[PDB]
Amino acid sequence: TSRLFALIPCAGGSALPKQYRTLAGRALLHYTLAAFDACSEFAQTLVVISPDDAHFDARRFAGLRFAVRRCGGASRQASVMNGLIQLAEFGATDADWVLVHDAARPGITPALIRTLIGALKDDPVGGIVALPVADTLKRVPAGGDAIERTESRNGLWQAQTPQMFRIGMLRDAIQRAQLEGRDLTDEASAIEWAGHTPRVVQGSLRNFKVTYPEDFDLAEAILAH
């Protein structure tokens, strides 16, 4: 009876926001929306943008099934929480699932989404897609390129998105951290501070986060193919 909602958080002489940057003809956000659009089991996809956003153009995402609300906040933290609250308009309850995905990971696929769903649908908490740390870890002090020592990678995973939790538990988790003045990284860390135990499901290398110009080039090679 737990339905599936998708939540895509977006933020704004600053340059163009990353989610609107062109990747092989299409905007960056388009790949995330298309991935969730291909999954008809979702109730609705919600894009959260800033109320001052003057770059979002709905016609560039035509034919895709999603809704957009300008309920953005100061941080990604607030933007997610406001989105969870906003989901109640679409008939969402606190018992329903929400998948929060970073638009900076355009390599997301319906196959990876459905793998996460099928692996955590019966979990009391939920979890995230992640990759085990494969590379040797080197500690390099700030302000220098010199290696101090090698750090153990035993039991370390690289977190990815989407992150699958229930709306009620996640909203209250982010709420509690916002009041405590705790700056979080992802939705999983919120669940962790709230006292729950999130799960990891095997992710993918093509689900990497783009940031640097070279990451766009790789993504343009992986995608559009």
Under the phi-then-psi rule, with left for phi > 0, alpha for psi from -120 to 50, and beta for the rest, what region is 143?
Answer: left
| Helix, strand or coil, per DSSP, at residue 132 | strand
- Closest C-alpha to 39, from 93, 103, 113: 113
Q: Cβ contacts of residue 73 below 8 Å, gap of 6+?
A: 79, 81, 82
Nearest to 165 by CA among 65, 92, 78: 92
Distance separating alpha carbons of residues 132 and 82, to the nearest angstrom: 31
Experimental method: X-ray
Contact between 167 and 96 (Cβ < 8 Å):
yes
> Which of 220, 169, 189, 190 has the alpha carbon at shortest distance from 2?
169
Angle at 110 between CA 107 and CA 112, to 5 degrees: 70
Q: Given this structure, which CATH class describes domain 1-225?
A: alpha beta
Query: In this structure, what token pair is assigned to residue 71?
Result: 């309920």
Q: How many whole angstroms separate alpha carbon 41 and alpha carbon 28?
A: 23
- What is the β-pairing status of strands 4-9 and 97-100? parallel
Of 223, 208, 174, the closest CA to residue 7 belongs to 174
Residue 167 β-bridge partners: none
Helix (H, G, I), strand (E, B) or coil at 68: strand
CB 14 within 8 Å of CB 53: no
SS (H, E, C) 158-186: EEEEEEEEEHHHHHHHHHHHHHCCCCCCC
Q: Exposed, middle or buried by CB within 10 Å (0-12, 13-18, 19+), for 150?
A: exposed
Q: From residue 216, how far is each of 18, 21, 22, 31, 110 by CA, in Å?
A: 10, 9, 9, 13, 21
Resolution value (Å, 1 decimal): 2.5
Token pair 């919600």 is found at 46
Q: Can you read off the two tokens belonging to residue 84?
A: 């969870």
Residue extents of the structural domains in the chain: 1-225
> H/E element holding 213?
helix 213-222
The C-alpha atoms of residue 25 and residue 106 are separated, in whole angstroms, by: 13
Task: Report how far Cα 2 is from the mean position of its chain's Cα atoms.
Answer: 20
Torsion (CA) 115, 116, 120, 126 in degrees, nearest 10? 180
CA end-to-end distance (rounded Å), the chain: 37
> Angle CA(26)–CA(101)–CA(46) in degrees, nearest 5?
80
DSSP 74-94: SSHHHHHHHHHHHGGGGT--T
d(CA 220, CA 225) in angstroms, rounded, equals 8
Separation of alpha carbons 188 and 20, rounded Å: 26
Rounded to whole angstroms, the Cα distance separating 29 from 103 reads 5
What is the phi-psi region of residue 170: left when phi exceeds 0, alpha when psi lies from -120 to 50, beta otherwise? alpha
